[PDB]
Amino acid sequence: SHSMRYFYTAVSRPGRGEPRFIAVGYVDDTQFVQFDSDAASPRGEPRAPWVEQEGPEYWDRETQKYKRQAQTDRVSLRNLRGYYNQSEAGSHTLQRMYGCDLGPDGRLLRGYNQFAYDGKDYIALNEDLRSWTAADKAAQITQRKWEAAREAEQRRAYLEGTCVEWLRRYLENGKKTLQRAEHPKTHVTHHPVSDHEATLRCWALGFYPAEITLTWQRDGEDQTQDTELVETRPAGDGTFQKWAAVVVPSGEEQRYTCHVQHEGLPEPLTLRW
Amino acid sequence: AKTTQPISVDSYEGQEVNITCSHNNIATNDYITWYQQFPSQGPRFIIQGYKTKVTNEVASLFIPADRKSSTLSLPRVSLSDTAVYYCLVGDMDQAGTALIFGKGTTLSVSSDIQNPDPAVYQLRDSKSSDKSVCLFTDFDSQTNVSQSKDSDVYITDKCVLDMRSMDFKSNSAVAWSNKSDFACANAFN
Amino acid sequence: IQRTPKIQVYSRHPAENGKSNFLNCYVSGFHPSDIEVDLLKNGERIEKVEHSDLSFSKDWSFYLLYYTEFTPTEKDEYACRVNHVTLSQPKIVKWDRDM
Amino acid sequence: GVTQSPTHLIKTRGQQVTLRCSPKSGHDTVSWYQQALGQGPQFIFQYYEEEERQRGNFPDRFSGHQFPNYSSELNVNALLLGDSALYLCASSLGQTNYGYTFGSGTRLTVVEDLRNVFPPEVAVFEPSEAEISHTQKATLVCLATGFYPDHVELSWWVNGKEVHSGVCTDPQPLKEQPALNDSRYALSSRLRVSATFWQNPRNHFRCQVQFYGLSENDEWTQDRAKPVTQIVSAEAWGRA
Amino acid sequence: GADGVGKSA
Ligand SMILES: [Mg+2]
Ligand SMILES: [Mg+2]
């Protein structure tokens, strides 16, 4: 299930001037656009080759929306400070996430449009794309405001229509990267840590997309409670990395097997030391 | 994505009318909508679409796969469909560009007169016995009424009326003048 | 609410002494967004370090990737120094080529 | 719907105007357009939340206003003859193009002098007996002549009630002197009825012309009658 | 392609 997702961050700054507005847009785990209100002359900027060849009208219209969104978020931050009776002397953060998931019929599987204030849920469009869930009494002020303005109908029109159509266009123009999974390249390393013990570390490198599962088994049964996992992390080139480690008694290494599940793999992998 | 469309389309009552519109520069965040403007009125919404054929009670809208054109289809036109038709490509993004109009297409609708009987009649004023008017009436709809060449003779364009209870339609034009030897038998020749 | 950054320091490719690579410092799970991240070579700050565009996860916590070109050697020591409102002192995570 | 006022207005070169528009109920965005004769509407500006949010290709003497209740003003000073146009208002919700709804417009004519304005003369001409004998139908013809500017609405009234069946009015007026930029106009209309209906002397036929002209506050100095907004009519009874 | 701009909070 492919997705397109936008991430807006608006941060007020007392005395330094206008709030800073940063936007990033992704298709699946691939970023394709960035906007930063603090840039020299702020403009939507390509981050993936399948939008770099879009013409000047595309980038002009994207830039105009980001500029207007920054101005509206500044008003929102001011209103929120009033809702919570907070100080001008403090900096505050307004975050927005929205986008569409592509369904098997090529239309919307689900749409979302969610907000957070200072790191906590503030208000969210419900999956019906018609009604809102407010997190506290302050967000109920916004909800009544957005209900009166029929904000949800405006957002629903984008999420069900324009969002899906952009996503389908991107998936076609970036077909050779966005619709081609990159299988993880795997190997196991061995490091004695104590002197009847050794760390077996199972590595997964260079895979796309980021979703992956790494599991250690001792005698066919999962060693979940003794497995250290790191969070999946970016390699910096568009691919991701992850590893899982267990401390095993020296001489028992050949019992342990690492198991790899990923979209780029026709069948799950089994590795041993 | 500005639109371009024919200057005019001519038609007869009861036929299907198609008005095609070109918009090669349409974008993914653009939709297609058509308005009609009757005399003495503002433009009025007809139909809208994105990529799928649309049909409502007033028209159909055809959009080919590349969306670089669109065709408004009026099923069985009547005289009351005479209007200017505007094809618009509109920004779907909220707070984007407001609707920008192109030139538009003037649609005229003629009636196929049954038993035409073209004749010129002289009418006399209700108040005056000095002023008089000539009426060219009951001619077929392909008749061209030439404008006046004499600077003191006035000739109006043709106009169709509908005597509804009698199931009868007729074209007519009017000529008048203030000069001495103005006669009606030669007014429209 | 405030969240402390998690820090991972690693190479883009398995480290081999003498061959060019990319040194990565991945900072995640933090809030608010203001953060300072320096890459260190033998205790001294590396110049011209780039970073990805500010994004955030599903719990709204932010993540950033700092990175620079480098050629690892046997005894060159690399680290990542992060300071955040949640950190009384900068946290310094040394690079371990086995992690 | 969208409410625009006034429907018609005359001003002289150099004057200023305020046109007004109230959006359709449920709409809070207002867009103004200028439509000159034979052209499509040209975008002036759009107002939302009491602020001008975008503007077309129009000079600063075109200015706008939007009240808290979403109603709007189009203000134009230093009027020129080229400003003569149909000024259209369109309303929508929150600056979306979906549901865009136009008013009927304000017809504004800028004239060189107040004495350019002339009311219409209206005459009705009774049906030809040759038409009646041949077709057993009877066509009445109405002429509205000598008026300026083209601010007229013509209607037919039979026994005190407006009729539309059997009526047809020129879609465009004639310029009485086509070489003059401010030529006065003529307009013709026809009403066709059965001969028996026209031959009933109790039937009353009226051609009625509404003319939108000068206001009470326009100062008239000429010897001829002030060409105020007025209703001019000509009539005839049936003839046995 | 980004969404348009609606009401402030
Ligand atoms: Mg003159
Ligand atoms: Mg008084």
The set of chains that have 3 or more CB pairs under 8 A with D is: A, B, E
Contact C60 A119 (CB under 8 A): yes
Structural domain count, chain D:
2
| Same domain membership, residue D94 and residue D127 | no
Say if D194 is an interface residue toward chain B (CB within 8 Å).
yes
Mention the CATH class of domain C1-99: mainly beta
Neighbours of ion ligand 1 (CB under 5 A): D 182
**Experimental method of this PDB entry:** X-ray
Best of B2, B28, B67 to mutate (most A CBs within 10 Å, chain A): B28
Partner residues linked to D102 by β-bridges: D90
CB D110, CB D80: distance < 8 Å: yes
| Same domain membership, residue D197 and residue D140 | yes
Contact residues on chain A for D28, CB-CB shorter than 8 A: 149
Cα C38 to chain centroid distance, Å, stands at 7
| Same domain membership, residue D174 and residue D120 | yes
Contact C53 A24 (CB under 8 A): yes
Q: Minimal CA–CA distance to A142: which of A155, A130, A132?
A: A132
Contact residues on chain B for A58, CB-CB shorter than 8 A: 27
Say if B65 is an interface residue toward chain A (CB within 8 Å).
no
Chain D nearest CA to E7, separation (Å):
8
Report the CATH number that the domain containing residue D86 is assigned in CATH: 2.60.40.10
Tokens of residue B169, six digits: 């339609």
Cα–Cα dist A246/A224, whole Å: 9
Beta strands in D40-113 (DSSP E): 42-48, 51-55, 62-66, 72-76, 85-92, 101-102, 106-111
- φ/ψ (deg, to 5) at C52: -70, 175
Any idea which residue has 């007869």 for tokens?
B12
Domain residue ranges of chain C, discontinuous segments joined by +: 1-99
| Same domain membership, residue D34 and residue D134 | no
Q: Minimal CA–CA distance to A44: which of A29, A20, A23?
A: A23
Q: Which of D87, D112, D137 is the last residue of a domain?
A: D112
Helix segments in D74-233, DSSP class H: 129-135, 195-198
Type of residue numbered D111: V
- φ/ψ (deg, to 5) at A56: -65, -30
| Same domain membership, residue D50 and residue D39 | yes
Say if E3 is an interface residue toward chain D (CB within 8 Å).
no
8-state DSSP, D200: -
Contact E1 B28 (CB under 8 A): yes
Partner residues linked to B62 by β-bridges: B71
| Same domain membership, residue D95 and residue D8 | yes
CB D140, CB D41: distance < 8 Å: no
8-state DSSP, D228: B
| Same domain membership, residue D173 and residue D231 | yes
| Same domain membership, residue D170 and residue D89 | no
Residue D192 is nearest to which of B31, B100, B163, comparing CB atoms? B163
CB B102, CB B50: distance < 8 Å: no
Edge-to-edge strand list for the sheet holding A213-217: A213-217, A257-261, A269-272
Please report the domains of chain A, with CATH numbers, ordered by start residue. 1-180 (3.30.500.10), 181-271 (2.60.40.10)
**Pairing mode, strands D106-111 and D8-12:** parallel
Cα–Cα dist A26/A6, whole Å: 6
Phi-psi region of C47 (alpha: psi -120 to 50; beta: other; left: phi over 0): beta
Q: Minimal CA–CA distance to D235: which of D127, D157, D164?
A: D157
Q: Residue A96: how many CB atoms within 10 A of its CB?
A: 20
| Same domain membership, residue D193 and residue D102 | no
8-state DSSP, B99: P
Cα–Cα dist D108/D211, whole Å: 14
- φ/ψ (deg, to 5) at B146: -65, 145
Residue partners of B84: CB distance under 8 A and separation at least 6: B36, B37, B104, B105, B106, B107
- φ/ψ (deg, to 5) at D43: -75, 130
CB A20, CB A11: distance < 8 Å: yes
Cα–Cα dist D72/C48, whole Å: 54
Q: Which of D51, D81, D112 is the last residue of a domain?
A: D112
| Same domain membership, residue D122 and residue D215 | yes
| Same domain membership, residue D8 and residue D22 | yes
Q: Which helix (H) or strand (E) holds A67?
A: helix A56-83
Domain hosting residue D201, numbered range:
113-240
| Same domain membership, residue D133 and residue D49 | no
The SS3 of residue A93 is strand
Q: Residue B130: how many CB atoms within 10 A of its CB?
A: 8
Say if B55 is an interface residue toward chain A (CB within 8 Å).
no
- Residue D193's closest chain B neighbor by CA? B163
Q: Which of D94, D112, D130 is the last residue of a domain?
A: D112
Q: Residue D39: how many CB atoms within 10 A of its CB?
A: 13
